[model samples]
Target: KIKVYLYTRVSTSIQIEGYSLEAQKSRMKAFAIYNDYEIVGEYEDAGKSGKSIEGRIQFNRMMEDIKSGKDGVSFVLVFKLSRFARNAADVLSTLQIMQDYGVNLICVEDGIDSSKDKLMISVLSAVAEIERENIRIQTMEGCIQKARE
Candidate 1:
């Protein structure tokens, strides 16, 4: 069985609404079992934004571990592309780096396995970025409308 590292994140708002870290971990663990993969490490960046990797302590640490061969992980599993990164550029660049190291990514919910399909991953990443931008615009408009009231 291939060894894997599982990473899960939820924004502050999502975490508040329901997506608890424990729930994510449980889902990831279930995925691992279903795939017959051994989970070597689990990284959680709770209350984090997907807009950028900046300030994501656990995520950065996970990368460090991966690069240093500390985790011995062949794949990094996430719930979905949106949970991975909201910035398409960041997502693509980071995936490229991981590929260079012989690491692969899997989005469990989306049924995306980087080794098998790359174009879909890029498309979904871009879609996620667009959605995030739309959310930002909507929030800004709401704030401005409140100010006008």
Candidate 2:
């Protein structure tokens, strides 16, 4: 009754349980199987920052394929929207493109479905972007503080 594509992107941050490439893929697979959805294919961008959409071969290929209607996947599944992209503009614009093709996005961890709600993606993406910045700032703060000793 459903066709979806699994998408996972892991940069260098967060290697904990649920954030790894394997973790992301496994969670999506489990979610798909649990919902009895058919996974048309999967695209992974390992060690590629979601902050930049360019140079991500698999992500671009997936988008191109979606535009081509090669798989006719109704949904793109990810562990979270951050996995989709840390850039809010890219996230929103990409959602627009996917919606144009009648494809929605599903964030497994965040429980987001573009079909039913679009506002959440925008908000969450903004949060993710700022969160990324905060991580850097906080880490630098820690390092600078330690150097004072």
Candidate 3:
């Protein structure tokens, strides 16, 4: 059985369309059950912007935990790639660090699983970073433009 850690996020109040932490947790549990993976941990960061890295206390803690364990962690699963991280440099750096320890990154929604292909996984991870940046830009521009009018 795979040892998996779950990561989830909720950016705002308006996105109440089953994207909340509760929803993500439920989905993650179900997925873990279906795949027969042991859930080592579940970390969440709600009311937080996916673009920002400052306020993610749980996220930082999770990273620390993963780093300390090294080869102990089999995989880190997130509902989506964006929830894992938006910063390309941060993502790449973390992945490289984990790679040293034989830990894999798994993004269920985006279908980016690092356990299978380590080389191609980095490229797909970059795509995830781009997607995250685009989402951040669009959200900020939309809200800012609305406020200006």
Candidate 4:
């Protein structure tokens, strides 16, 4: 079986949409089982923002393992691309680093695997980032309107 790392993230912004840590873990574990991939490592960053990777402790730790060749994690599985990051640049840059570390990234829910061409990944990341920006704008507007009232 292929050795893989499982990574899950739950940001408050996506909590209402049912992206809870348990839900993501359940679905991803099922996916890993169905694909017969051996989950050698698991990383979770709860109540974290996908907007930036700098402050995510668990994510950084996982990267350290992958970079140091300590875990032998050939693949890193995420529940979805948006859970990985909301910024296309961050996604691509980190993915490139993972590539350098000889690891592939997969988003199980979105059917994206980094072993293939990246045109679709680019578009999906851009759309996700735009959606996040829209959410931020809507929240700001709501706050402003409430203050005005």
Candidate 5:
């Protein structure tokens, strides 16, 4: 059986309301079974910002696992790509490192299966990066507009 890892995260405000760690664990477990993979471990961080990859405890743990030849136990599953990271540089470097280590990223919400289109990963990474910038700009604009009113 292929070993698998499920990761889930929630922003500080929603950690208590939107997705509890237990709820995410349940979803990840179900996802593991649905995909015919064995749940080897689960990592989670609540109230963590995607922008600060270094600050995420579970992500750091996963990176340590990667360094220990635990990269491709089977797959690293996340609810979505945005949940993986919002920082462009971090996303690019992390994906490259994972690719080199034979780890597959399965973003359930986006239907992104890196195992299939490995080469397309760079493209997706760029897209995710641009999306982050767009959101950032929009957020700044909204804040400025509100201040002007």
Candidate 6:
């Protein structure tokens, strides 16, 4: 029903090839085919870190190349919604920029679509916010624990 690309990424060495990056793309690729969304492109941050999806080199390239509405796609199918950013604010603003450029985002893990009433964005923000809290809570604690060594 739509033209989309598959995207997945990692924050650091934390969630790299261990079980997130490659695994994520496979799932997203599967979802794209099952849903009949034309697969236009695929990009991932691999082992990159940044405040936003735009932080990754390939992701940054996506933003620039997808402009002019000539990439032959309207949506980016990400396996996980938070694959774009770690925080709710960045998640929301990240899609904001994409939408302004005629691109919308869809998360296959959940049926979140930016082209709709955008109700999903609010719901996504909620999920991202909570996920962020737990992430830092554990990350900070773990960092401190390891630092104690």
Candidate whose TM-score is highest: 1
Model 4: worst 10 consecutive residues (lDDT sum):
47-56
- Per-residue lDDT tens digits for candidate 1, residues 1-149, read 89999988765544362456677678889989988999988887776464432346788888888888876789999988778775676777778878888899998888889988668666857876887899899999999999999
Off-target runs (Cα >4 Å) in candidate 3 are 12-19, 48-54, 121-149
TM-score, every prediction: 0.71, 0.71, 0.68, 0.71, 0.69, 0.69
Residue 138, candidate 4: Cα error in Å is: 19
Among all windows of ten consecutive residues in candidate 6, which has the lowest summed lDDT?
Answer: 47-56
Query: Candidate 3: what lDDT?
Result: 0.74
Model 3 lDDT tens row, 12-67: 43244325667767877887898899988877776445443324678888878887
Q: Single out the weakest 10-residue window by summed lDDT for candidate 1.
A: 47-56
Q: Write the per-residue lDDT of candidate 6 for residues 20-49, one digit (tens) a residue.
A: 667777888878778788887878777644
Looking at candidate 2, what is the lDDT of residue 9? 72
Global lDDT of model 4: 0.80
Angstrom error of the Cα, residue 36, model 5: value is: 1.5
lDDT of 5 by residue, 3-78 (tens): 7778777645343534555665676677778878987777776664534322368887986786677545757888
Model 4 CA deviation exceeding 4 Å by range: 13-19, 48-55, 118-149
Give the lDDT of residue 55 in candidate 1. Answer: 46
Better of 4 and 6 by TM-score: 4
Q: What is the lDDT of residue 82 in candidate 3?
A: 63
Model 1 spans with C-alpha error above 4 angstroms: 13-19, 48-54, 118-149
lDDT of 2 by residue, 28-136 (tens): 8999999999999988776544443334678899999999999879999988877777577667778888889889999899998888875766685786688779889
CA shift at 5, candidate 4, in angstroms? Answer: 0.7
Residue runs of model 5 more than 4 Å from their true location after superposition:
13-23, 48-54, 70-72, 125-149
Give the Cα error of residue 8 in candidate 3, in Å: 1.1
Error of 1 at 59 (Å): 0.4
